[PDB]
């Protein structure tokens, strides 16, 4: 029990640090926002 608990806590700490450190860990969500913004910007730019 003690070893498993220690491993689980260490894994939680490690994943928290990895998320807080790397910047490109959430591409799968930023891509949708960027695509929608691009579509809207192009649609507006079509006015001219």
């Amino acid at each position: 029990q003690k070893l498993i608990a220690n491993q689980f806590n260490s894994a939680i700490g490690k994943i928290q640090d990895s998320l807080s450190s790397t910047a490109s860990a959430l591409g799968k969500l930023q891509d949708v926002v960027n695509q929608n913004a691009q579509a809207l910007n192009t649609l507006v730019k079509q006015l001219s």
Binding site: N41, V44, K45, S48
Partner: protein, 48 residues
Amino acid sequence: LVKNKCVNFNFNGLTGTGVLTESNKKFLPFQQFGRDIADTTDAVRDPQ
């Protein structure tokens, strides 16, 4: 000019309707108009 009201402005030829408000934040050193990312006028300098 009347501010904070939906008016139909015309500054030196350029038309459009909207609400004209104080824009002390924007600084125009010698430029006339204003513009946005989507290429739309958003601030004008009063010729008077």
